[PDB]
Design a protein around this ligand. Structure first.
Ligand SMILES: NC(=O)c1ccc[n+]([C@@H]2O[C@H](COP(=O)([O-])OP(=O)(O)OC[C@H]3O[C@@H](n4cnc5c(N)ncnc54)[C@H](O)[C@@H]3O)[C@@H](O)[C@H]2O)c1
Ligand SMILES: NC(=O)c1ccc[n+]([C@@H]2O[C@H](COP(=O)([O-])OP(=O)(O)OC[C@H]3O[C@@H](n4cnc5c(N)ncnc54)[C@H](O)[C@@H]3O)[C@@H](O)[C@H]2O)c1
Ligand SMILES: NC(=O)c1ccc[n+]([C@@H]2O[C@H](COP(=O)([O-])OP(=O)(O)OC[C@H]3O[C@@H](n4cnc5c(N)ncnc54)[C@H](O)[C@@H]3O)[C@@H](O)[C@H]2O)c1
Ligand SMILES: NC(=O)c1ccc[n+]([C@@H]2O[C@H](COP(=O)([O-])OP(=O)(O)OC[C@H]3O[C@@H](n4cnc5c(N)ncnc54)[C@H](O)[C@@H]3O)[C@@H](O)[C@H]2O)c1
Ligand SMILES: [Ca+2]
Ligand SMILES: [Ca+2]
Ligand SMILES: [Cl-]
Ligand SMILES: [Cl-]
Ligand SMILES: [Cl-]
Ligand SMILES: [Cl-]
Lengths: 260, 260, 260, 260
């Protein structure tokens, strides 16, 4: 479906990000993964992409909290691939705490990566897409880009901002063959979520899996986690021709989170 | 991808409904088509579904503006197909006029088909899906189920109603293997819209195509119509395993209509 | 102050509606109340409005589930008042049950009163307001006009429809000195809710007040009911000159219900 | 209505901010104004507030793009007022340009003032309100906090982020007697907009008032500017008891902008 396409997924050495690339490569596109982690684990994950899907899978390192590094990352990603058709701004972090106790450094970090990096990434990639007359920018927002939760001020603020940025990107390139949409996932059991599950496990002194059940129960009606593969599935769909007129909107796979 | 699945599409003898029955059949699903029109045309359409995609297709005439007739409809639809996995509530009508001049009969008519029919169809289909532990109810709302336009009170109201009903449907069956989502299309150049394109032409006394380009400009940022095939592509996606945790939400393909 | 203004409120013989009337009379406008109930209790309510606020208060009976009756209702009200500046479509009913078990008569009764009556009421009032060049149509929707809850398909669909109808009314009359907005309340402890609190109290065999605290904890972060008086305050605000440019939007008073 | 209350409004030396302080002072609340400008002009506004409405009024300068300075500012404001009941985060700036051409320094300045400043101001004031057990945090967002417009990436991103931050603030203090809401204005003819009106007057080479008339038509169906005095009345309302259960939501005064 996406043979010959060139995809770039930020923060893809693990979690949802890795699943994104895994699904894009499976669809036939050459992928550029990015993120942190042990060099070996990264290489093994990269090579596995080539072995299983027979596509060119490159790896570029870049700390996206750095504005210039992110923009350089895009140009470098384009050179390795020979172009840039699909951009997935996935990288992001979290920190829990009430507003009055939220560390300025934490607020700045979350905003820098979860919001500003989408901008810099989009800005550097748009010229390439505008020139080609085709493109796909897929921002990974969250149910938290639509509604809020306590003690997540910076995150909820960044995600909401991502949703708005997504809308602007779409309007500025409407009808140019370029679309911009935001995937808003519900709970996905990655290390980012296990941390919150573990905190609950201690605070309430309950079973680990009982805590995970509690975390789901409060926000996800299905009482089932969203899977990284499923989200990858969504990205593949947004990159299809059937989504040619889908732009500046949100794609919620949250098991009912925002229906109530 | 949908081999062995059994689908039903209301208002599918022409326009968007037909294109969605086509995409589903093309995906491997047996289908039940419905609507009005010349019998020979309807037959040729039912006939081509079976020959082109090697699936079983059936046609059942029923005026979904009637509650009981709608309930009889899916009942017979289920018997014909030998089940019911995917239900697409698509049949709808339009009527333009300011509120103080809107005909009571036109209001009742639109709420009846565009909204109540969705409820009756869903209520009759759910027991079958609930029993199986799997199901997909795809409602066709509109960008007008999220925002409004002048002189479309009954339609915007009903479309908004469908979005609410979609949410309730998803919540009641969360985790049961059943999901309910609403496709919210922007401008699709079908007869329902051509009628509005002609009203503009005869109004400003301008080219019919000049009227079409004026229709888009005012609401659809892309300045490109959404195609029936693209909507069907969306239905196929909602029906996939990737959308297992996508429920109670809206899928907008409106060329950026709702982004601004 | 609303001295000189003529206000009309449907379903105002008790509950939110009565508070709506009470706050408008207090602000200085003459009001016409409507609804069912014991004539003794109704005359008391009507009479209290008169002696407590020094305004004229009339009572007009009419089952708003009847399109014509409602249209005749606002015609008389406008006659008894000597005009019509503020209209509050408040009348509403509720039935709780899952879709597949939802009685068709209940679905029809809810749509007819909760949605259709809002359209007919508006239709008949607009010509009068359009002629004066000033008007206010305040629709009492709900948090269920924006989000959903299990077993309230007809109600949620109806309320979502009111939100849409509100947007249309507003656009069709933009700049004419007429605004239309929907107040969307969270839990308000009226006889409509008490019935739901008791069903919880009996169902789970818990204290009646413990049922109330549970009902709130599930949807209202503030853990405090919204009061009919507060909602009446909102209407008075929507009727003020400060709200001249507020139109086609929703006003949520739900203790944070929709924030999450 | 607000006699004895203590209010703080950022960016209140001119424009919407000053109108907010005015209506608050008029309502009887002591106010603290802030913002840039010539010292004599600033003193004048502070002076008129004091004598015209007979309340206390102080001016505290502070470049709110400085986290530490904004936190110190509210500490000084509370000290000057002898408490802090109402905080209105109004300060904001704009810059128009396509994403790929958007200056990074402009992106940073907008996020810092339009979004971060709201966070820091809120963080510093909550402890004070939490102690008294009563509070109002009114955030001035925009229609651009719910929808988008071309060439306003940083601004839309920021405003959406403010909408999200508002919800978190409200949720973290649900029931504590503290509410947080976001006023979402449409076009308001302040210097921030004149600049944009002039740009159209120049580009299209048309009348300055024709440009102002044209700026309205594209987004505001009422074809009327929302006035500063009206937004001030909105803030006065949000501070009233009727809004005790109104929290974590948006109050749109956009003349129908978001209705379509
Ligand atoms: N887990 C959920 O339930 C959930 C829900 C909604 C949205 N999301 C989002 O999905 C995206 C991925 O989150 P996740 O759950 O996979 O977390 P994760 O911890 O599993 O993954 C974060 C990925 O980004 C890398 N990363 C770290 N710092 C980085 C930096 N400075 N620059 C670039 N990459 C960096 C990580 O090493 C990792 O590969 C995020 O932005 C997060 O908002 C997650
Ligand atoms: N055309 C657009 O731009 C557009 C935009 C948004 C949503 N939609 C929706 O797409 C769906 C299909 O609309 P359309 O544009 O294809 O219109 P259409 O006129 O092209 O198709 C309507 C289909 O329903 C049949 N129908 C007529 N009365 C019926 C009844 N009582 N019961 C069952 N079927 C009946 C029609 O004969 C036809 O096959 C609708 O509900 C409409 O809301 C269309
Ligand atoms: N109670 C809540 O928590 C809550 C929350 C959100 C919205 N609402 C809405 O507030 C409005 C008032 O609801 P309520 O709680 O006061 O219920 P209520 O039972 O207390 O009041 C309903 C009013 O309408 C009258 N009514 C009955 N049938 C009528 C008819 N055919 N025509 C005209 N009036 C009729 C009633 O007798 C009564 O005076 C409604 O539309 C309901 O949606 C209530
Ligand atoms: N004008 C509109 O149509 C409109 C529409 C929607 C939202 N808004 C918002 O209303 C709020 C006020 O905007 P405005 O139209 O009055 O613009 P303005 O230019 O008229 O006012 C900005 C106020 O903030 C001060 N300000 C400048 N830099 C500052 C800083 N670093 N720290 C603190 N204050 C600073 C200004 O000097 C001025 O007093 C804003 O955040 C803007 O988003 C305006
Ligand atoms: Ca919600
Ligand atoms: Ca819109
Ligand atoms: Cl929460
Ligand atoms: Cl319109
Ligand atoms: Cl629920
Ligand atoms: Cl725009």
């Amino acid at each position: 479906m996406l043979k010959g396409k060139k995809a770039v997924v930020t923060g893809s050495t693990s979690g949802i990000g890795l699943a994104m690339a895994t699904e894009l490569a499976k669809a036939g596109a050459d992928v550029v993964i990015n993120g942190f982690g042990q060099p070996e684990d990264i290489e093994r994950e990269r090579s596995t992409l080539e072995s299983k899907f027979g596509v060119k899978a490159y790896y570029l390192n870049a700390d996206l909290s750095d504005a210039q590094a992110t923009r350089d990352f895009i140009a470098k990603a384009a050179e390795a691939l020979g172009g840039l058709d699909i951009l997935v701004n996935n990288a992001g972090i979290q920190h829990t705490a009430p507003i009055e106790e939220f560390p300025v450094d934490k607020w700045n970090a979350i905003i820098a990566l979860n919001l500003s990096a989408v901008f810099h990434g989009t800005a550097a990639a748009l010229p390439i897409m505008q020139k080609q007359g085709w493109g796909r920018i897929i921002n990974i927002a969250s149910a938290h880009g639509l509604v809020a939760s306590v003690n997540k001020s910076a995150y909820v603020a960044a995600k909401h901002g991502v949703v708005g940025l997504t809308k602007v990107t779409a309007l500025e390139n409407a009808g140019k063959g370029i679309t911009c949409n935001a995937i808003c996932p519900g709970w996905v059991r990655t290390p980012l979520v296990e941390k919150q599950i573990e905190a609950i496990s201690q605070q309430k002194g309950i079973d680990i899996e009982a805590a995970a059940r509690e975390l789901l129960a409060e926000k996800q009606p299905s009482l089932q986690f969203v899977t990284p593969e499923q989200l990858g599935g969504a990205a593949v769909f947004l990159s299809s021709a059937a989504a040619d007129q889908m732009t500046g909107t949100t794609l919620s796979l949250d098991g009912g989170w925002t229906a109530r």
